[PDB]
Amino acid sequence: MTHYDVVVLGAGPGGYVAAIRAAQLGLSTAIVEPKYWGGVCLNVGCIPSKALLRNAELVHIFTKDAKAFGISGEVTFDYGIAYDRSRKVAEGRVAGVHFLMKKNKITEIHGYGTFADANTLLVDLNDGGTESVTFDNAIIATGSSTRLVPGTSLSANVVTYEEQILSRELPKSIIIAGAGAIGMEFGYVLKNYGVDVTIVEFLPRALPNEDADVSKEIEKQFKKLGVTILTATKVESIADGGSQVTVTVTKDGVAQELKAEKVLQAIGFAPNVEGYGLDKAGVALTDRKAIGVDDYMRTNVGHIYAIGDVNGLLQLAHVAEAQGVVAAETIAGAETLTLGDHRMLPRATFCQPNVASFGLTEQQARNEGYDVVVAKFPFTANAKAHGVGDPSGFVKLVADAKHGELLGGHLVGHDVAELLPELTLAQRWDLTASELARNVHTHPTMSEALQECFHGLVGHMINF
Amino acid sequence: THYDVVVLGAGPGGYVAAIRAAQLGLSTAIVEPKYWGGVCLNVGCIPSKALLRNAELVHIFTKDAKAFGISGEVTFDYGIAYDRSRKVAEGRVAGVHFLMKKNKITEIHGYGTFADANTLLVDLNDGGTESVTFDNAIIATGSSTRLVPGTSLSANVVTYEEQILSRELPKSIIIAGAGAIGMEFGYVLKNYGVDVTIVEFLPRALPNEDADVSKEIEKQFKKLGVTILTATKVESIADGGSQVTVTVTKDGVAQELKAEKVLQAIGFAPNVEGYGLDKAGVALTDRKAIGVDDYMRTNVGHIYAIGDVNGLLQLAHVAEAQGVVAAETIAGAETLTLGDHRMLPRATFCQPNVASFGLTEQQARNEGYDVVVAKFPFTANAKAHGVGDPSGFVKLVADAKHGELLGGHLVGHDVAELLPELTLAQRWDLTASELARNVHTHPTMSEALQECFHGLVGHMINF
Numbered sequence: 001m002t003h004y005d006v007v008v009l010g011a012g013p014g015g016y017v018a019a020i021r022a023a024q025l026g027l028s029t030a031i032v033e034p035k036y037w038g039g040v041c042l043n044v045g046c047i048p049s050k051a052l053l054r055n056a057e058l059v060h061i062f063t064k065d066a067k068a069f070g071i072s073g074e075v076t077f078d079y080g081i082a083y084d085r086s087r088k089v090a091e092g093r094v095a096g097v098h099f100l101m102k103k104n105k106i107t108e109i110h111g112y113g114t115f116a117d118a119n120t121l122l123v124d125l126n127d128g129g130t131e132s133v134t135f136d137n138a139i140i141a142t143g144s145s146t147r148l149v150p151g152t153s154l155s156a157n158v159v160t161y162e163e164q165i166l167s168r169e170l171p172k173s174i175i176i177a178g179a180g181a182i183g184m185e186f187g188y189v190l191k192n193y194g195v196d197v198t199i200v201e202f203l204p205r206a207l208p209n210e211d212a213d214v215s216k217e218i219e220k221q222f223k224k225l226g227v228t229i230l231t232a233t234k235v236e237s238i239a240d241g242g243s244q245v246t247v248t249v250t251k252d253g254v255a256q257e258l259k260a261e262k263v264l265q266a267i268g269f270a271p272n273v274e275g276y277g278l279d280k281a282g283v284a285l286t287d288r289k290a291i292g293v294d295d296y297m298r299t300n301v302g303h304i305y306a307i308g309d310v311n312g313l314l315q316l317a318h319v320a321e322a323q324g325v326v327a328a329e330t331i332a333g334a335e336t337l338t339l340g341d342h343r344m345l346p347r348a349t350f351c352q353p354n355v356a357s358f359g360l361t362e363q364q365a366r367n368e369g370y371d372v373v374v375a376k377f378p379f380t381a382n383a384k385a386h387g388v389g390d391p392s393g394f395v396k397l398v399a400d401a402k403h404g405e406l407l408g409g410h411l412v413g414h415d416v417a418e419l420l421p422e423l424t425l426a427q428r429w430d431l432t433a434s435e436l437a438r439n440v441h442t443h444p445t446m447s448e449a450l451q452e453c454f455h456g457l458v459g460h461m462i463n464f
Numbered sequence: 465t466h467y468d469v470v471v472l473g474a475g476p477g478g479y480v481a482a483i484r485a486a487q488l489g490l491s492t493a494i495v496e497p498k499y500w501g502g503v504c505l506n507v508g509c510i511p512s513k514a515l516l517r518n519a520e521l522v523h524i525f526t527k528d529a530k531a532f533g534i535s536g537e538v539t540f541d542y543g544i545a546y547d548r549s550r551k552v553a554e555g556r557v558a559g560v561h562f563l564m565k566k567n568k569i570t571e572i573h574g575y576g577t578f579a580d581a582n583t584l585l586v587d588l589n590d591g592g593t594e595s596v597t598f599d600n601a602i603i604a605t606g607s608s609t610r611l612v613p614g615t616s617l618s619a620n621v622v623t624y625e626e627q628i629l630s631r632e633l634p635k636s637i638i639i640a641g642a643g644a645i646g647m648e649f650g651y652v653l654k655n656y657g658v659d660v661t662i663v664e665f666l667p668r669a670l671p672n673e674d675a676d677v678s679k680e681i682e683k684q685f686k687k688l689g690v691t692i693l694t695a696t697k698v699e700s701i702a703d704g705g706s707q708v709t710v711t712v713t714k715d716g717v718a719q720e721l722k723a724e725k726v727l728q729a730i731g732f733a734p735n736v737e738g739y740g741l742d743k744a745g746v747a748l749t750d751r752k753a754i755g756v757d758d759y760m761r762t763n764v765g766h767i768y769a770i771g772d773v774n775g776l777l778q779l780a781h782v783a784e785a786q787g788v789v790a791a792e793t794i795a796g797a798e799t800l801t802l803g804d805h806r807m808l809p810r811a812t813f814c815q816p817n818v819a820s821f822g823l824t825e826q827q828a829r830n831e832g833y834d835v836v837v838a839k840f841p842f843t844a845n846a847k848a849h850g851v852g853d854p855s856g857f858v859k860l861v862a863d864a865k866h867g868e869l870l871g872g873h874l875v876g877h878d879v880a881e882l883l884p885e886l887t888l889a890q891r892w893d894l895t896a897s898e899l900a901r902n903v904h905t906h907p908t909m910s911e912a913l914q915e916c917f918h919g920l921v922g923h924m925i926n927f
């Protein structure tokens with residue numbers, strides 16, 4: 001039985017990064033993955049996803065603003081090509097992971113890991129073999145799986161993001177359950193490629209986790225794009241009759257049946273917690289069936305850590321990575337910085353215009369008891385926005401009055417996902433609106449919209 | 465007719481300074497005879513970025529139609545691009561007037577000439593002539609095009625003004641000056657099928673940037689089809705009606721260049737003559753730019769100078785910032801000096817963009833710092849690949865003492881938007897170690913910055 005200082009389960013964004021950090025800190029490392037090196041993100045998530053969003057974005061432009069941009073000529077778009085490009089990008093990143101594992105002398109174990117003890121891991125190698133490994137520390141980065149609508153099930157026409165993302169051919173129509181980022185993005189792409197799209201969301205607003213002002217704007221954008229979004233509507237059942245699928249939904253005691261060629265299941269993702277002997281390791285779960293964890297990613301078992309979607313704190317790639325680093329550094333006894341309140345971490349939805357936020361929404365900060373101060377700046381008043389051809393959206397900043405400290409940021413606009421860094425940095429290192437308003441922003445850029453809010457937070461904006 | 469503050473010029477610096485002044489309860493009056501919003505909003509910034517956007521789409525299609533599964537025969541009409549640039553421009557200019565009324569700032573439509581240290585003589589556009597006194601004055605007269613020594617303007621030898629206000633495009637053009645402005649025109653024109661040749665006296669293009677950036681940008685422009693001649697000196701320009709002949713010197717040998725039009729954009733001199741700066745007693749510097757202290761305060765106590773006229777960093781956001789400092793200093797409000805202007809951000813908007821701040825690698829080494837460099841290529845960035853352009857890189861320069869930043873230099877798809885975090889950190893003493901802990905959303909270009917931070921602190925992770 002080979003023995004490693006550290007052993008990681010799962011090669012996703014969190015796993016492969018936690019191994020890299022471990023290796024750097026001089027820790028004998030081995031990573032166990034049976035299928036996805038780079039996990040969901042690099043294989044059938046983040047990576048292929050954002051490549052497709054880019055193709056859809058172009059179709060959107062060369063279709064609605066072609067004339068406004070002085071572009072003429074009848075052009076067509078082949079989704080097949082978009083599909084092929086997303087797979088190549090995926091292949092590239094995946095090949096890059098192995099390079100990193102190699103560069104860092106990280107041992108690769110190709111199979112499925114199952115805890116047989118708090119320090120022993122039995123593996124079912126992909127080539128039929130079997131090998132057990134011991135370890136002083138273990139990092140569980142097993143990820144999550146798509147949660148299905150209760151009672152429903154997968155089939156030829158009822159699928160998860162996986163079967164859909166790996167589909168080179170597009171259906172005529174589709175019904176998406178869940179108005180979260182994942183659901184909205186597939187909607188943006190598909191709709192732009194000519195697919196009939198209807199998105200159902202139990203909650204009252206699309207992207208319910210975002211600030212209220214953001215949900216409204218985005219819903220207005222999608223309705224215009226031609227996508228039908230039904231909020232406060234419950235998906236009762238899903239029936240795949242082959243030639244088509246029938247989904248029944250209810251709202252205010254009144255039911256109606258929706259029908260389409262396919263239906264995508266995307267209401268949530270449950271942490272992968274069963275099937276690999278967590279019980280034999282003694283790792284406890286939370287009431288939401290997620291691996292319980294502390295500020296240093298430690299489970300109820302001192303030497304066993306849990307990172308990534310599997311802990312369900314913030315199911316995003318950058319978070320997984322970050323937690324991976326924290327787990328690694330803590331094991332090696334090196335200097336680290338707990339992520340702290342995960343609500344403060346940044347997040348983005350990549351439909352166009354983007355959605356980027358961090359921290360608390362206006363209403364949450366209100367309920368939390370802060371002396372809420374708000375500054376909203378519309379992009380219709382931003383030079384760069386008008387120059388790019390998309391002056392919609394806005395920048396909404398939430399802060400506390402006492403010292404002008406940032407509580408949260410909520411943005412909707414062209415590629416606004418790249419404007420968050422400044423906000424989170426200031427929030428983390430006690431920089432207030434006063435210090436923020438003194439940062440000169442290049443002209444003309446979307447980032448100037450952040451400068452204005454800083455001013456409208458400290459007092460009154462200048463160009464407004 | 466007296467005011468607490470009087471602003472000369474209504475460009476980015478003047479009109480923003482007037483707003484701030486007004487906000488501080490100061491009676492304010494601004495004098496402008498032609499361009500409300502100045503160069504920037506009328507014939508600079510605003511229309512320029514609009515045209516650059518159009519040219520980008522032409523590029524995106526031409527260069528990558530196939531790669532994106534976009535097939536078909538499309539054609540682009542510059543005239544329409546032109547039309548939109550004017551509309552976007554007129555929109556902003558109208559915005560200037562709106563803010564002037566909203567802040568009860570008085571508009572004076574004429575040219576201002578100093579008579580005293582507190583008196584301005586105004587030649588009204590209507591033909592009349594009036595006088596105005598003030599306790600404080602802000603000079604935001606901008607700059608003008610500096611012509612190549614011994615040459616002059618003519619039918620086919622123009623400045624950025626004529627060129628940018630031209631709805632029709634030439635078949636060929638020669639550009640004098642490989643600065644951002646010239647490079648941007650080269651980008652636009654080339655994408656629209658114009659033969660483009662850019663002549664630069666200095667050995668590199670974008671000579672003010674970091675050498676690695678100059679090298680990288682020159683490569684992409686050559687791939688675009690733009691001919692750039694560096695270490696080449698423009699000797700003379702002969703407008704012959706049909707074709708313009710530009711005599712140049714490269715490698716101690718004289719050769720001729722020919723095109724229909726020639727754009728003069730090697731530099732811009734601060735507007736300092738013709739309006740009585742001497743009557744007011746304001747002193748100019750060796751380079752003939754109004755001298756100012758860290759508060760935009762000239763040798764004349766109650767007289768300030770902001771924008772291009774002081775030549776510190778000729779950019780609109782710089783112009784706006786100094787105006788705020790001036791207005792606050794005048795009212796005696798809470799203010800913060802801009803500090804070392806070299807530490808201010810700047811971006812060139814060709815595609816890919818160029819974005820930087822602080823010192824170049826060579827400058828930091830020359831300054832005597834304990835240079836530490838971390839460079840990350842976008843070929844390793846998921847977002848860059850998704851975008852369809854993994855070219856470019858992020859190059860950060862820091863001092864090894866505590867890991868304080870000295871400069872940032874990048875080239876990549878819309879990198880101009882990525883500077884905020886860097887200038888903020890350098891401004892409030894946040895070192896590499898602090899910056900290395902800021903989480904960046906995935907997948908974004910900003911992640912490249914994140915890797916560089918780790919590189920400075922020790923080892924990157926995804927490279």
Ligand SMILES: Cc1cc2nc3c(=O)[nH]c(=O)nc-3n(C[C@H](O)[C@H](O)[C@H](O)COP(=O)(O)OP(=O)(O)OC[C@H]3O[C@@H](n4cnc5c(N)ncnc54)[C@H](O)[C@@H]3O)c2cc1C
Nearest residue numbers: 010012013014036039040041045113143308309315316317
């Ligand atoms: C369509 C889609 C788009 C997305 N877009 C984004 C985006 O733009 N940005 C973002 O930040 N996030 C995005 N996400 C979410 C992101 O993919 C996840 O947050 C991230 O993959 C979680 O990383 P992880 O390492 O925790 O787990 P995963 O990437 O899920 O990897 C876990 C790995 O563990 C392996 N494993 C499981 N059990 C075992 C075992 N017992 N033994 C060995 N190996 C095991 C699995 O095979 C799997 O490959 C997206 C998700 C989807 C579905």
Ligand SMILES: Cc1cc2nc3c(=O)[nH]c(=O)nc-3n(C[C@H](O)[C@H](O)[C@H](O)COP(=O)(O)OP(=O)(O)OC[C@H]3O[C@@H](n4cnc5c(N)ncnc54)[C@H](O)[C@@H]3O)c2cc1C
Nearest residue numbers: 473475476477499502503504508576606771772778779780
């Ligand atoms: C083609 C081009 C593109 C550019 N693009 C950018 C860009 O993308 N980003 C950027 O940051 N910068 C850009 N610039 C530079 C930017 O335009 C200048 O830095 C900025 O305009 C300077 O502002 P200012 O207020 O100092 O002066 P200006 O905007 O030049 O305004 C000076 C004003 O003063 C008036 N004036 C002069 N003398 C008198 C007098 N005696 N009495 C009354 N009024 C007077 C003038 O009529 C004029 O309107 C660009 C420049 C050009 C030429």
Ligand SMILES: COc1ccc(C(=O)N2CCC3(CC2)C(=O)N(CC(=O)NCCc2ccc(Cl)cc2Cl)CN3c2ccccc2)c(OC)c1
Nearest residue numbers: 180181182209210271288290312313314315347348349350
């Ligand atoms: C483009 O990349 C993507 C892909 C997915 C999402 C998304 O919709 N998420 C992930 C983040 C989310 C909500 C769901 C989360 O998992 N968190 C916890 C959470 O919401 N709770 C889930 C935990 C849970 C609940 C019940 C049960 Cl039974 C189990 C579990 Cl584990 C916080 N959070 C979020 C918060 C604010 C704004 C935006 C997002 C996303 O959103 C921007 C971007």
Ligand SMILES: COc1ccc(C(=O)N2CCC3(CC2)C(=O)N(CC(=O)NCCc2ccc(Cl)cc2Cl)CN3c2ccccc2)c(OC)c1
Nearest residue numbers: 643644672673732733751753775776777778810811812813
């Ligand atoms: C897309 O927006 C634009 C439009 C113009 C420029 C540009 O070419 N500039 C302005 C900044 C500049 C160099 C010239 C400057 O004015 N500086 C001072 C300066 O050089 N002083 C010149 C003033 C002057 C000129 C002529 C005369 Cl006769 C006197 C004086 Cl005082 C430094 N500097 C700079 C540019 C890039 C990286 C680092 C620094 C630009 O550049 C990014 C972007």
